[PDB]
Design a binder for this molecule. Sequence first.
Ligand SMILES: COc1ccc([N+](=O)[O-])cc1Cn1cc(CC(=O)O)c2ccc(-c3cc(N)cc(N)c3)cc21
Ligand SMILES: [Ca+2]
Ligand SMILES: [Ca+2]
Lengths: 440, 427
Amino acid sequence: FTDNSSPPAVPQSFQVAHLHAPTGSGKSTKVPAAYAAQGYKVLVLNPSVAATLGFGAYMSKAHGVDPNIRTGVRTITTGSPITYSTYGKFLADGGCSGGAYDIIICDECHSTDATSILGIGTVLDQAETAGARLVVLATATPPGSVTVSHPNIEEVALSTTGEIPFYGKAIPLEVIGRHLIFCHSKKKCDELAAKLVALGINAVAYYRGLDVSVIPTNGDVVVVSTDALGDFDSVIDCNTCVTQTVDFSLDPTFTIETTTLPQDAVSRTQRRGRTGRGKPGIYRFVAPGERPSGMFDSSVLCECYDAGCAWYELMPAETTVRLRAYMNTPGLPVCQDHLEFWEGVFTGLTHIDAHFLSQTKQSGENFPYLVAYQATVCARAQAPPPSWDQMWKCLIRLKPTLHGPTPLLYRLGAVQNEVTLTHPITKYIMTCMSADLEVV
Amino acid sequence: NSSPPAVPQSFQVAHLHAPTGSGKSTKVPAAYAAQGYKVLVLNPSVAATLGFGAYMSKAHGTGSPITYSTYGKFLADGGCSGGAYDIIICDECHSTDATSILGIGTVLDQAETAGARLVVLATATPPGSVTVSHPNIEEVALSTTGEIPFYGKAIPLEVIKGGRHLIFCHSKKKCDELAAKLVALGINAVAYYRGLDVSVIPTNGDVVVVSTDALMGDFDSVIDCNTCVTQTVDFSLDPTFTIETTTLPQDAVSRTQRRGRTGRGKPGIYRFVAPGERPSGMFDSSVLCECYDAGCAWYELMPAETTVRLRAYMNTPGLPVCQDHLEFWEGVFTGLTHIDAHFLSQTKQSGENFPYLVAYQATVCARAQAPPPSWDQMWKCLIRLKPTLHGPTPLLYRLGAVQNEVTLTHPITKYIMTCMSADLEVV
Ligand SMILES: COc1ccc([N+](=O)[O-])cc1Cn1cc(CC(=O)O)c2ccc(-c3cc(N)cc(N)c3)cc21
Ligand SMILES: [Ca+2]
Ligand SMILES: [Ca+2]
């Protein structure tokens, strides 16, 4: 392991190097290009499909280089020594295929969505055996990072005085041309935009579900958005974010739920970053502080196992090997060590209904395997799902499976039916909790 | 900011990131005093940092220009007295214990009106700080190879067989079990945790100390589980909230301090389960709840006065962050009226966490002549209990395990539930 602000030279024998470098300095473009120029074959991994496809187009337009591009929706093979791929497509491709790459760049290695973590873990477990010389863990914001001040951005502490209440402070009359306003939830987007629209401001709301097309492509506007997202004259930031957490609630087992926390440094820099691009921008904030970057929640580990089982045909023990490699590697975001627990949970979930899994994968549920497995248990007990929320629509053949209480394995959302807590799988998960979660 | 802030011309709040060395309560305050300024230095404690030696409050070290005190004494003294000091140094301002947070918040809210010219927020570990290497300490990852299982890894007998070693576990139960395993292998292992003191052989024979963070000789190596137990609040709606303890990865302050009990003078070895840590700079909402509790129980502070001090804290950049629940907690404690003064006196004197919350739950039990949620030691102010053995507990909130059956219909419960829906986002 090594620490760099400049591209690590290819060593003679295998090594993992940390690259901490600004976003503009072309981690995903100049770095792989300089490696390609030395004659190496380079894989560049990114969380985002749009980023991945976007690097292909840039390299073509700016350098007449047509890289291979590998994403879920689109795959291009040119034979270039440079390959751009998403973490998710990399995992679908089986991970590291022997002899293909000399160098693997794990870009935005600070990313803590499940795909990045399983993806980087997989690279770390497999790259050396596959014949890679160098693995580069690249990010502009390593663990512990805090937001630094931006030359072109005015940062203005908010206060009490204004004609709209904003998160314990106030958004004043005046300074809402084109502005972006970050709220933590969809409903406070709608309610703040319904307020601004009735106030005569051309304000429109965005969040997941809505399509970006609904946003006024230039011309005076005030956008009220979650993180689920042109450039603006200023950014206004509630400084909080809604994140997914697991609660070991013992009712009977665990709960996946959401929590509102102060934003971490990655959130703040990004939200701030939507202004001041070339032209001087202004940043308004409810709160002066922020969590440092570099932690993620145990619920993301659950996701990795869910995706391993649902998308990538990994036995839980195989997903554990990849994730263990991630957690044994220094300089990466950290999480509770719950690998044994989640491996245990998922290993106990046998003979899932393949049709139900296909539907939950199709409909884009957050834990397709967990959802399809609960529905599997419900159908075979001829019991109802835990609610009739759209999450459970693979059971719409409702009419027979109404017999009584729900055999509740875990809580993935609100539970509305009456429940029974003595299913063998429920008891199995409880035993895994006693076995693998540390007490006190 | 790496060196003492020059005294400004109008009131300012400066920060001092100083090295792990070059003390900020000992060399830095002297330089301010040599310029005619009256300096107040606040720390969590004025016991010598080593654990041995003079108190910092020692006369010469008295009509002197430098006063050494604590956040706890400062709050009990009523905060800032008018015109008493030019410079107030809030040292160790990364501390996220309730007393430190309420104390610093008080300094920030009051200093300028008291005529201070400068407030210095000094720490060796500003928010985002990560553990840095140590010239004198070799660090080695534990593998899965070894006789002694240890948090998913293993300790080889060789690295602790003979010599003097310190091993951190996250709980008493874990220390007992590990010590037992080691003794059964012919190791001289002693367990240490809250309430023992001296069984750690003051000798320097071979020994393996298995300990929590309760620990106050010296060691050839440290082995770290890299986890800690912390107090958290759960908004569980059963009926209201729960103060509970949970296990979490250690942060950089904890890692640095644990690792630091080896490599004192002679070289040392640090062996770890996890290569990483939580970065420092965040604390739980339950600490805010503690501030209001302590405000009501100890400092004669109306909730709105606690809010003012806490708000000053949260408006100041460079300090640990927390969820903005001031309005929620202020609202909760505002509703808690007519506490029985005699139960409060007892929960205060027994050293319980949340004495105001314990005594208030007890008060509500005595009036409805209902039993406490359990008979754990927490509820002993009620021990004259034969009358109030009747019926379910009017449960306000959960401060521990609940064994009696409960009613959720008390007005105070409803009130706190409503505060949750309106002041948080948790219905
Ligand atoms: C909604 O999809 C997901 C959502 C979450 C996760 N996860 O947390 O790991 C993984 C996936 C699966 N996934 C995420 C990507 C990234 C991308 O869209 O480029 C991807 C890409 C390809 C495949 C894939 C494609 C085929 N033909 C077959 C299989 N088994 C997977 C699955 C892929
Ligand atoms: Ca809970
Ligand atoms: Ca919870």
